[model samples]
Target: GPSLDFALSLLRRNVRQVQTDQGHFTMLGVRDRLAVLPRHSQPGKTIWIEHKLVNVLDAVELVDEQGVSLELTLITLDTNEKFRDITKFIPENISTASDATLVINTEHMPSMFVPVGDVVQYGFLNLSGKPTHRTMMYNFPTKAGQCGGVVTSVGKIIGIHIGGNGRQGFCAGLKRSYFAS
Candidate 1:
């Protein structure tokens, strides 16, 4: 279970509305006023963040020239006006930390689940052999918009909620080295 205080505070402080050409949804309002979202959120949309109507055409991908993986995406805000209570990416591995619960800020519906399983390294269905990135498997329903992150109980943003297949789904997460590399 996640710290109830974390979910409440997270929803109150760290979450923001991210609307693209597709629809209106929520994204984890990370530090530097950036929005952490999935690649499918698209680009060049006149999205509003923190009452500031800014156009985010740029997207930072975790993938490389070798075209190995394509997981993380970030839209940075130009305003240097510091953002507080951002999602915390813990320094330790949650899997080995002896606890791996999926903490999703379900908007009005707050929830916590330890729906854990094996970590995924490619071998996809539709994308064929093209691996997006390493992911954790959650044996639960996929949270489309509410899944800007798959946080841990200790209030760490573990992954982005990518699509899935039935019982087993994509906990589209990144490695700590994702930023280190």
Candidate 2:
């Protein structure tokens, strides 16, 4: 747990606590979905979700000073897994089932996802009344189940990483590069 300021600060920086949902903590936009992600990407012009600090309200008082358990969505701006330093990271593998996509649930919330390509693009209509998009790239596919797997990375996150890694929900072949493998 963190002070309100600390939690907000970390979340703003694309870091999070990675919590577990007990019975509280409303998972907004989840009842209608199984997973959600980006739709397109283009560098400085990409679209993404507004990040937040997810806190489990199950075991604590809302007014208590001790604070509730909290986790940061990977991206402070959007839930993109491309990493804050995108060029420095690439997904290593995908989990074969939804149960395998660990750590990402409380923060990234896959339930609201819809896959587009080798990468899951998150989409929305902007203030201009036009479509805006952002992408969370993974080796996972858009249509795959997301339990029981691991997405090995260059960062600190480990354990069963749920991969819709290829959209079919397994980590096999991620992209069909025209150049090389």
Candidate 3:
């Protein structure tokens, strides 16, 4: 099960999930900083600019460990910025290295499930840093869990929910197998 505070954070982020209130997550305290820039025309004009590209990757996915298939929203993880997911980066919380038990909730299903032990088999496919990219798939084996579960990944700036019956779901808000294309 997801922590109370973390679950609240997800609701604030406008994220949609079965466990979330109104089936939508929300985001708060999303701080934005301006970058200092130098203008060639001006001598001392230190322009304050918003960094369009926040070098942080924070996305979550629900996967089937044994099937090597992405269960949740499908995402083309070829984008550089999108690849910077804090959920996966934090080993203590989300580890894509091996069989990690993840917290998952399926819609029209139960609340949460302990699938595989706190470890996920994560890796990338067709990554080139350009818009033309492939999928980053994580395999969550049944030994770490059962069917009809949801995987929740949380971080300082983002929270993701992986849901399904180990057969269907979405990744990054995109649905299963659909992202493979």
lDDT digits (tens) for residues 1-181 of candidate 2 = 2222322322244332222222111111211111112111111222223334432211211111233211111112233233332112223332122212222223344322222223232222232232222212344443322232222222312222222334343222111110011
Number of the top TM-score candidate? 1
TM-score of model number 3: 0.26
List, residue by residue over 73-104, the lDDT tens digit for candidate 1: 77765565555634336433424223445544
Question: What residue pairs clash in candidate 1, if any at all?
Answer: none
- Residue 50 lDDT (model 3): 23
Of candidates 2 and 1, the better by TM-score = 1
Candidate 3: segments with Cα more than 4 A from true spot: 1-4, 11-103, 120-150, 153-181
Tell me the alpha-carbon RMSD of every candidate.
4.3, 17.3, 15.3
Candidate structures ordered by TM-score, highest first = 1, 3, 2
For candidate 2, the lDDT comes to 0.24
* Residue range 1-181, candidate 3, lDDT tens digits: 3344554443333122221212321111111211110011111112111212222223333344444333232212112222212232222322232332333333332234333323233233222131111122334333211221233444321112232225332112222222122
